[PDB]
Amino acid sequence: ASGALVFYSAVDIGQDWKSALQAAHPGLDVRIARAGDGHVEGDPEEVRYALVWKPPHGFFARFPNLKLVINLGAGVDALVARDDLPDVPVTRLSDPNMSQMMASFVLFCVLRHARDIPTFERAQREGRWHYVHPRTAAEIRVGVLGLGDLGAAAALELARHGFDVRGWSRTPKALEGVSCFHGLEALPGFLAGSEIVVVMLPLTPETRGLMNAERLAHLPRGAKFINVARGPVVDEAALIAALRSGHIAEATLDVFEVEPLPVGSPLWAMDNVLVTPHLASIAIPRTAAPQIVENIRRIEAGEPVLNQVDPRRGY
C-alpha cells in the first residue's frame, strides 16, 4: 500500500531519478520538490519516503507521515547534523555499482602513485626522457583508513593487484588478504607501515581532523596521500606543511575542507598534488533505484531496511 516518494536535489536531475524509480516500481507516486525552497505539489500527508540531498531547513517537517529518509550520497554527515531530522529510519545509497566505481577510482589513484606517474609528468613538461626502474606491487604497502562498503571493496581490489594491503577500522574486522588493524591505539602503527594511504572514513566528530600534524608524522617519509572521503578528516594546513617539508611526497585529493577549493589554496599549483572536484564515485539512477524501491517494500512490510545509518554516530 505504497505512499508517495518526495525527491529533493538542486544538483541531481529529478526526472532521471523519477523515471528510474517508476521503472523499478511501476505506478510509484514520485513528486519532485522545487529546487531552493522545496515546495512540492499534492497532498503532503501522502508522502511517506524522502530521497534528498541537502534539502532546505524544515523540509522534513512538511511531511508528517514520513516513514523513511534516503540520502542521495553514501555520506550522511550533513544530513545527521540537522535539527529537523525526523525520528524514522535514515538510509543512504550504497549499491554494488557505486562500490565498483569507487574501488576503480581508488585503484587508479594508488596505481598512479605506485607507478611514479607524477615523476614522468614532471619530466615530460621539461622534455626529458628519464627511466625510473618500476617497483612491483608486492614491494608497496597500501593502507586504507575505513573498511566499510566502499573501504573494504577498495582494500580487496588493491589486494588483487598484489599490493601489501592493510586496513583500519573502529572495531575488529576480518578481511581476507588484508592486514586488519582497529582502534585508536593501533593507528600510529597502521600509519607507520603505509607507504601509500587512502582516506575512506566518514566525517564524524571522531574523524574530524584525525589526520592532523601528529598523525601525518606517523606516516613514513615519502608517503603518498590519497583522500576520497571528506576533506575535514584531514587538517589541510598540516597536509600542506607536510607536502612542503617533503614528509608527504605526493597527494591525490578529491575532497577538501572548503569545497570548491579556494583559488588561494597552495594545493592548486603543486605539481605533486592531483586535485579532482569531489567526484570519486556517484550513484546512478538506473542502478541505484532497485535498493530504494526494495526499502519502500520493506518499510511497508515492517521489515528492517537496507543501508541504514546511525544518526548518533553519523554513518
| Binding of ligand NDP by 70 (CB under 6 A) | no
Count of residues of this chain found to bind ligand NDP when the rule CB under 6 A is applied:
30
Binders in 138-167 for its own copies, by CB under 8 A: 161-162
Letters for 241-260 (x = contact with ligand NDP by CB under 6 A, - = none) are -------------xx-----
182 in catalytic set: no
Catalytic residue among 278, 297, 312, 313: 278
Please identify, using beta-carbon distances, which residue of 56 and 202 lies nearer to ligand NDP: 202
Binders in 174-203 for ligand NDP, by CB under 6 A: 200-203
Letters for 117-156 (x = contact with ligand NDP by CB under 6 A, - = none) are -----------------------------xxxxxx-----
DSSP the chain: ---EEEEE-SSS-HHHHHHHHHHHSTT--EEEPPTTT----S-GGGEEEEEESSPPTTTGGG-TT--EEEESSS--HHHHT-TT--SS-EEE---HHHHHHHHHHHHHHHHHHHTTHHHHHHHHHTT---------GGG-EEEEE--SHHHHHHHHHHHHTT-EEEEEESS----TTSEEEESGGGHHHHHHT-SEEEE-PPP-TTTTT-BSHHHHHHSPTTEEEEE-S-GGGB-HHHHHHHHHTTSEEEEEES--SSSSPPTT-TTTT-TTEEE--S-S----HHHHHHHHHHHHHHHHHTPPPTTB--TTTT-
40 is in an annotated binding site: no
Residue 272 CB, nearest distance to its own copies (Å)?
12
135 in catalytic set: no
17 binds, among ligand NDP, its own copies, none (CB under 5 to 8 A by kind): none
169 binds, among ligand NDP, its own copies, none (CB under 5 to 8 A by kind): ligand NDP
Active-site annotation, residues: 230, 278
Positions in the binding site for ligand NDP (CB under 6 A): 74-75, 94, 102, 146-151, 169-171, 200-204, 206-207, 228-230, 254-255, 278-281, 315
